[PDB]
Amino acid sequence: IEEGKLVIWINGDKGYNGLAEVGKKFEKDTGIKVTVEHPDKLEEKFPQVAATGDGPDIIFWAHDRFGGYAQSGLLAEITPAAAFQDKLYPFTWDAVRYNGKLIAYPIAVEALSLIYNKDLLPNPPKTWEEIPALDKELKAKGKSALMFNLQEPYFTWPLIAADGGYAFKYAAGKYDIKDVGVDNAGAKAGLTFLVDLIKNKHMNADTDYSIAEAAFNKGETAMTINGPWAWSNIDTSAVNYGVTVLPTFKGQPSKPFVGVLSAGINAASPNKELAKEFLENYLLTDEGLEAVNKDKPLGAVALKSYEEELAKDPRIAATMENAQKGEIMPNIPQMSAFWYAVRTAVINAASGRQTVDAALAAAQTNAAAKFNFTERDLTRDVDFNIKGDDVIVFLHIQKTGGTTFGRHLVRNIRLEQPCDCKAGQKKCTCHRPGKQESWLFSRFSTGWSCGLHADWTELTNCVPVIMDRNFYYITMLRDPVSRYLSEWKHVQRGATWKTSLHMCDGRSPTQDELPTCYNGDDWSGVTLHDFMDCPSNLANNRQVRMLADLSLVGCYNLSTMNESERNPILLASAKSNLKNMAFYGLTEFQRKTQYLFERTFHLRFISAFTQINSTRAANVELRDDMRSRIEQLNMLDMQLYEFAKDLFLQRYQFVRQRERQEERLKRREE
Numbered sequence: 306i307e308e309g310k311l312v313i314w315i316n317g318d319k320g321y322n323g324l325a326e327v328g329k330k331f332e333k334d335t336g337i338k339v340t341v342e343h344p345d346k347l348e349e350k351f352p353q354v355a356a357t358g359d360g361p362d363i364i365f366w367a368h369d370r371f372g373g374y375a376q377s378g379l380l381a382e383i384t385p386a387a388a389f390q391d392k393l394y395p396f397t398w399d400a401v402r403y404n405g406k407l408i409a410y411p412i413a414v415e416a417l418s419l420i421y422n423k424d425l426l427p428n429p430p431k432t433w434e435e436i437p438a439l440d441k442e443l444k445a446k447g448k449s450a451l452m453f454n455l456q457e458p459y460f461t462w463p464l465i466a467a468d469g470g471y472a473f474k475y476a477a478g479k480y481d482i483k484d485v486g487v488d489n490a491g492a493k494a495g496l497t498f499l500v501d502l503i504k505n506k507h508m509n510a511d512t513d514y515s516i517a518e519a520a521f522n523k524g525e526t527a528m529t530i531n532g533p534w535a536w537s538n539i540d541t542s543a544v545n546y547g548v549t550v551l552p553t554f555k556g557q558p559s560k561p562f563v564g565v566l567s568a569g570i571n572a573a574s575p576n577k578e579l580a581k582e583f584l585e586n587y588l589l590t591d592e593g594l595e596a597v598n599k600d601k602p603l604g605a606v607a608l609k610s611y612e613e614e615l616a617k618d619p620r621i622a623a624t625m626e627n628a629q630k631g632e633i634m635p636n637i638p639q640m641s642a643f644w645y646a647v648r649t650a651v652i653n654a655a656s657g658r659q660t661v662d663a664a665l666a667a668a669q670t671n672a673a674a675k676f677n678f679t680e681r682d683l684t685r686d687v688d689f690n691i692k693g694d695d696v697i698v699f700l701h702i703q704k705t706g707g708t709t710f711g712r713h714l715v716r717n718i719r720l721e722q723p724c725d726c727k728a729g730q731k732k733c734t735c736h737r738p739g740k741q742e743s744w745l746f747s748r749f750s751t752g753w754s755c756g757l758h759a760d761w762t763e764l765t766n767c768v769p770v771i772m773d774r775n776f777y778y779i780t781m782l783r784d785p786v787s788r789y790l791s792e793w794k795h796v797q798r799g800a801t802w803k804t805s806l807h808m809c810d811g812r813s814p815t816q817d818e819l820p821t822c823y824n825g826d827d828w829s830g831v832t833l834h835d836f837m838d839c840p841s842n843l844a845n846n847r848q849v850r851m852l853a854d855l856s857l858v859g860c861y862n863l864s865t866m867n868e869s870e871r872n873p874i875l876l877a878s879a880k881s882n883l884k885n886m887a888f889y890g891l892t893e894f895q896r897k898t899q900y901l902f903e904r905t906f907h908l909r910f911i912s913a914f915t916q917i918n919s920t921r922a923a924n925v926e927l928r929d930d931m932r933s934r935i936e937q938l939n940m941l942d943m944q945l946y947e948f949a950k951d952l953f954l955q956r957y958q959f960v961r962q963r964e965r966q967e968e969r970l971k972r973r974e975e
């Protein structure tokens with residue numbers, strides 16, 4: 306981001322040419338250039354790039370996305386004088402308040418309305434229920450009743466919410482992120498109606514924004530559902546249209562989710578005062594807003610003075626009617642998870658590939674960020690025969706507390722013949738009784754015989770050869786921000802692990818495949834900024850990479866497939882390999898780790914594990930924005946760890962409960 310310039314991001318369905326005009330006036334008056342851009346998926350890109358030193362100075366989106374940005378420290382708190390604040394409506398400022406702080410400037414209120422072609426349909430239907438009959442009439446004329454975007458849940462939500470669907474329950478002054486309303490009876494009734502429209506061929510599951518707009522603007526369908534921004538192209542096509550209240554469902558209003566177009570200032574911007582000047586004194590004026598509105602209409606604007614000027618527009622009146630009947634969107638971080646969940650559910654139910662009940666049950670789980678596991682997932686019972694051919698293999702991922710855990714395995718297990726750990730000697734002899742055969746494959750027993758910090762791909766391909774059995778793989782995992790910081794500090798004091806083989810498909814990577822991040826013999830002294838800056842840093846997503854079958858993505862050759870392909874493959878492989886291991890622990894839960902290992906393998910340790918809170922990672926003072934950047938660099942790990950933590954904790958609860966019940970039964974007998 307350059308100082309003395311403004312870069313602005315706004316979505317491509319908005320009046321960006323109009324905004325650019327406002328930017329030109331600001332430039333005329335101040336010599337400061339303003340660059341407007343409308344990148345695809347700007348709302349996903351922003352938290353990926355703003356976490357670094359890049360991104361726009363100002364980002365425009367509906368307010369629902371901004372709580373997540375603010376929680377991640379990506380937005381500047383906005384500091385409008387009371388005088389300015391009074392120029393906008395208070396309920397629009399509420400839309401942009403997060404944890405008590407104002408995090409953006411509200412611009413305009415948007416709600417979906419029913420838009421109809423007066424040359425085909427002079428009185429629009431008042432109910433969803435009459436649409437099928439109406440369609441039958443229109444089909445005999447070679448037309449259809451209704452087409453709208455079925456791919457974005459924004460557009461189907463009004464019908465789903467009408468009879469009772471909700472996102473997150475509001476109770477006791479906040480949104481309850483565990484109380485999700487996407488699979489209740491009202492939600493199902495709404496979605497069922499939509500799926501029935503499609504089954505009866507009144508709509509097509511494939512219809513998206515472009516298809517619906519093209520049909521309406523060409524006079525092929527009598528109605529569409531859309532927002533104020535859409536009115537411009539309709540006018541361009543010279544359709545004689547009206548904008549009105551959405552149809553009712555089961556006698557109740559459609560309830561659209563109401564968005565407030567908002568402008569946030571990037572926390573990493575060197576131009577915060579200039580962005581403030583632009584927004585308050587150029588955009589949020591009658592003239593600034595008129596420029597944008599004339600390009601693509603904004604809806605009901607937040608600035609009282611200009612809202613009053615336009616209030617007479619019946620299209621805006623309909624917009625306010627629909628907005629009053631709907632709900633303002635939550636701005637909480639969990640909103641994006643809600644939307645992603647419903648998006649998928651609607652597509653799969655609409656297509657007929659999944660029933661409404663199943664699809665919405667899936668959305669329910671996803672929106673609430675829950676994980677469902679089978680009994681089999683929770684039960685890990687190994688009759689570990691140390692006298693037999695059983696072998697435990699410890700896959701040690703760097704900086705997960707593996708030195709501690711590996712020491713426990715060789716020093717701390719009660720066995721008839723425990724590992725022989727000679728004083729002043731790194732490794733131990735962990736042999737079966739009477740034999741010269743090892744029961745433990747690990748750094749402190751057999752050594753790094755399949756390579757330094759051999760990962761899942763290396764071990765599963767090397768261990769069976771180098772030992773000739775039942776192999777019981779185990780590992781430890783750590784929250785990725787802490788693990789990443791620990792690795793940074795260790796590399797900063799000399800660690801390279803440069804002798805690791807990184808074998809996959811029978812060879813090590815080439816230098817082209819895996820470039821080194823440092824010149825010279827190590828990366829000692831590296832700042833966290835420079836650590837984060839190297840694209841080929843093996844610290845990024847280390848736990849996923851080391852748990853996945855890397856052959857599935859062409860090993861270390863990043864040109865073999867795109868990131869959109871490779872990433873879901875890696876995460877799924879890591880999850881599966883982890884889940885299917887005999888056991889794993891978590892660094893943050895030392896006592897539970899001990900207990901589960903003991904109960905899995907029917908072994909006991911001599912001394913209790915202990916929790917060390919004062920780690921080198923914990924001692925790093927971390928700005929939220931930098932924490933966010935570390936999360937983004939480790940996004941696969943973040944997802945793996947969320948999965949792993951929940952499964953680990955469900956395993957703990959399951960095993961403990963079973964054991965408590967067993968004790969009780971024995972007592973009941975006596």
Ligand SMILES: O=C(O)[C@H]1O[C@@H](Oc2ccc([N+](=O)[O-])cc2)[C@H](O)[C@@H](O)[C@@H]1O[C@H]1O[C@H](CO)[C@@H](O[C@@H]2O[C@@H](C(=O)O)[C@@H](O[C@H]3O[C@H](CO)[C@@H](O[C@@H]4O[C@H](C(=O)O)[C@@H](O[C@H]5O[C@H](CO)[C@@H](O)[C@H](O)[C@H]5NS(=O)(=O)O)[C@H](O)[C@H]4O)[C@H](O)[C@H]3NS(=O)(=O)O)[C@H](O)[C@H]2OS(=O)(=O)O)[C@H](O)[C@H]1NS(=O)(=O)O
Binds near residue numbers: 732
């Ligand atoms: O045997 C020979 O061939 C010998 O021959 C001699 O010549 C003759 C001998 C005899 C006769 N005769 O007539 O009788 C004639 C001629 C010749 O002079 C020798 O050069 C030659 O020796 C060669 O072979 C031997 C045997 O293989 C080699 O010795 C082995 O390997 C040594 C070694 O590699 O240094 C040494 O191993 C011990 O020490 C290593 C280094 O500390 C240990 O490996 C390290 O483990 C670290 C760890 O786990 O902590 C790891 O650290 C990294 O990860 C951790 C955890 O994440 C982090 O904390 C660290 O920060 C991180 N550091 S990093 O970022 O820098 O990576 C290290 O990476 C890893 O290297 C090793 O475990 C340890 N093994 S031991 O405990 O068993 O001792 C030993 O001497 C020996 O090991 S072993 O075979 O017994 O297992 C010798 O190196 C080799 N010399 S060479 O010049 O040919 O290369």
Ligand SMILES: OC[C@H]1O[C@H](O[C@H]2[C@H](O)[C@@H](O)[C@@H](O[C@H]3[C@H](O)[C@@H](O)[C@@H](O[C@H]4[C@H](O)[C@@H](O)[C@@H](O)O[C@@H]4CO)O[C@@H]3CO)O[C@@H]2CO)[C@H](O)[C@@H](O)[C@@H]1O
Binds near residue numbers: 370
């Ligand atoms: O990978 C699947 C898709 O993911 C991405 O779309 C996501 C967004 O990133 C989420 O934020 C969310 O989108 C919401 C949106 O936040 C909400 O404001 C509303 O968007 C309206 C908007 O307010 C209005 O001004 C106008 O622009 O129409 C928008 C609707 O199209 O509703 C959105 C949900 O429909 O969820 C979507 C997932 O549906 C990514 O951008 C997609 O390209 C990708 O396919």
Ligand SMILES: Nc1ncnc2c1ncn2[C@@H]1O[C@H](COP(=O)(O)O)[C@@H](OP(=O)(O)O)[C@H]1O
Binds near residue numbers: 703892917
């Ligand atoms: N019992 C324990 N409780 C908490 N953290 C522990 C631990 N034993 C080790 N760790 C942490 O695990 C990291 C070392 O992992 P490894 O042995 O795999 O390299 C260190 O993190 P820090 O570098 O942040 O201090 C260490 O503090």
Ligand SMILES: [Cl-]
Binds near residue numbers: 751753
């Ligand atoms: Cl070794």
Ligand SMILES: [Cl-]
Binds near residue numbers: 893894897898
């Ligand atoms: Cl614990």
Ligand code: NA
Binds near residue numbers: 732
């Ligand atoms: Na040795």
Ligand code: NA
Binds near residue numbers: 828
């Ligand atoms: Na160096």
Ligand code: NA
Binds near residue numbers: 922923924925926927
């Ligand atoms: Na800290």
